[PDB]
Amino acid sequence: KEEAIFRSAEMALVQFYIPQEISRDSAYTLGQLGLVQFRDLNSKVRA
Amino acid sequence: LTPNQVNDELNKMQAFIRKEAEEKAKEIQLKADQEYEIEKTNIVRNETNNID
Amino acid sequence: ATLQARLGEMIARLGIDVPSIIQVLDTNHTPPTFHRTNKFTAGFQSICDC
Amino acid sequence: MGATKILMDSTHFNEIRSIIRSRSVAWDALARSEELSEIDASTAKALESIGKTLIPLIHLLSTSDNEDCKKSVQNLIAELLSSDKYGDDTVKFFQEDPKQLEQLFDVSLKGDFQTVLISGFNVVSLLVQNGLHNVKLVEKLLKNNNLINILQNIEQMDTCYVCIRLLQELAVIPEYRDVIWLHEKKFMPTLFKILQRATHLGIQLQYHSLLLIWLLTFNPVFANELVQKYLSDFLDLLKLVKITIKEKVSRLCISIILQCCSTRVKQHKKVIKQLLLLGNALPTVQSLSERKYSDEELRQDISNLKEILENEYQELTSFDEYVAELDSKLLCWSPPHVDNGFWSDNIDEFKKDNYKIFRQLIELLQAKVRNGDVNAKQEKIIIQVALNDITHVVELLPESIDVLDKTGGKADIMELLNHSDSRVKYEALKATQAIIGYTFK
């Protein structure tokens, strides 16, 4: 149904486990979907 | 429903990983057997050249 | 559900049969702040939450 | 439970087993119908329930004319072979008496497509044991028209996958490896067709198909035969590996390519390496090395292939090779990027005998232009290579401009600047700019 926003909607923290082969394709389709915010995972590893 | 589906998908992914590992192990075993056949025959000839 | 359906559609598009399902992890951390907004409200909400 | 057992994915083979297991009235009803023997009925009673009675069961199956009953019996035997609770007994009952294996094989490879597939799977599992290889029986099975027809029918993806898996399993034993290639033309073109089509079951079909080709690629003589008689698929394998998604398929393809190009195989040092250069394999291998393959074995294979390609390219940088190529027609593109270029020693040698090599190249270009066949694709490629070499030589040796002008090379190049061949037109324009920009200044 509708998911309008007074102030926000209940959002979830979801973890992803994906195979190596389709990882790039999943990233591309997720980016062109654009709905999830990835929290920090390897910020310790410098650039 | 979703947690049961999540567990089923995790089991399926584990089974797929195990199957891929088994296939890789079988390919490695075949390649190792072929390499052993190739090298041992060459190594046997090298060691038996003096005997010949 | 929509995200999982899209991921499954992608997996069908690809040749890999390995599942890539996802599950919720309910942590104690503060969740982010999401505001759907039409063009009649986007600028309003942006100026308000500046 | 036996030395080894098949591990087919059975996307539809499992459904076939279930359908065969679905109908079971023929186990005992045929005996009441005076079809099967009473001893046959007793034997089939055990089959109905989920060491020595196998032989009368085989005899009843051979004598039985009801195709459904024979299919059910064969499915039960196959399940007993596959089942761990009876796998050891199933292996032993044929290992201790290998004579009946030939009769069992002759009983197989007949009936309906599903029935024939089940019987063939059972026969392959029986013949894949550690003992009793029975190479003659394997050759007879390969010569069977039913299995070959099933394999060739690429439309039935499930049946083709089952046949490919059975053939690949039957080729595990090196004793039957050579006999497999004895009828290579019967199946391999279909196998190479599967890889060409690619460029769950579909991914699995490619993996075993690549494995089947790789498995037969162990013998260096067979490797050379496959590289020569089917050079198209061998060349397209690089593109397939480049566009492959699963890491296993790419690793198998890289291993197959390396084995084909291995120095052990005869004529691999030169013919195979040149064929790789004939397929633009160097940039593809460079890109593959750039890509971060997950498998360490795949990375090592990629490194070895890159080293082999680099050695082949270095061997292709011989000024003698360039001279030999220029002596004949149909110039190749791998030398002229180094010899008429970074390998300035080749240019210095070409300078000798008052630009002898430059004069020969100009004569070849003038003959090609005067022939009037510039529209030909091969002639266009030859003209482009000649123009590139001439442009490279002109920059190194300005004195050749006078030779070109005296021989009419400048006028020929100017005329070729208007040629419709855009690929040749770019080279012609570059050569004209080099001649006018540097020498004419």
Helix-strand layout with pairing:
This is part of a larger assembly, with 2 copies of chain A, 1 copy of chain B (52 residues) and 1 copy of chain D (441 residues).
Chain A: E1 14-16, H1 23-33
Chain B: H1 2-48
Chain D: H1 13-22, H2 29-32, H3 38-48, H4 54-63, H5 67-82, H6 84-95, H7 99-107, H8 113-127, H9 135-143, H10 145-152, H11 157-170, H12 177-182, H13 184-198, H14 201-216, H15 220-229, H16 231-243, H17 247-260, H18 268-278, H19 281-290, H20 296-316, H21 319-327, H22 338-342, H23 344-371, H24 377-396, H25 400-406, H26 409-416, H27 422-439
PDB class: membrane protein
Keywords: V-ATPase, membrane protein
Entry title: V-ATPase from Saccharomyces cerevisiae, State 1
Plain-language structure description:
Chain D: V-ATPase is a heteromultimeric enzyme composed of a peripheral catalytic V1 complex (components A to H) attached to an integral membrane V0 proton pore complex (components: a, c, c', c'', d, e, f and VOA1). Interacts with YND1. Chain D: InterPro entries: ARM-like, ARM-type_fold, ATPase_V1-cplx_hsu, ATPase_V1-cplx_hsu_C, ATPase_V1-cplx_hsu_C_sf. Chain D: It is a peripheral membrane protein. Chain D: One of its GO terms (cellular component) is fungal-type vacuole membrane. This is part of a larger assembly, with two copies of chain A, one copy of chain B (52 residues) and one copy of chain D (441 residues). Chain A is built from one helix and one strand; from the N terminus they run βα. Chain A is of the alpha+beta class. The radius of gyration of chain A is 15 Å and the shape is extended. Chain B is an all-alpha fold and 52 residues long. The radius of gyration of chain D is 31 Å and the shape is elongated. The longest helix of chain D is centred in the last third of the chain and has 28 residues. Classes of the chains: A alpha+beta (47), B mainly alpha (52), D mainly alpha (441). At the A-D interface, loops of A face loops of D. Strand 1 of chain A pairs antiparallel with strand 1 of chain C, so a sheet runs across the interface.
Q: What overall form of chain D do the CA principal axes indicate?
A: elongated
Radius of gyration of chain A, taken over Cα atoms and rounded to an integer in Å: 15 Å
Question: Beta-strand percentage of chain A?
Answer: 5-15%
Number of strands of chain A: 1
Number of helices of chain A: 1
In CATH terms, what is the architecture of the largest domain in chain D? Alpha Horseshoe
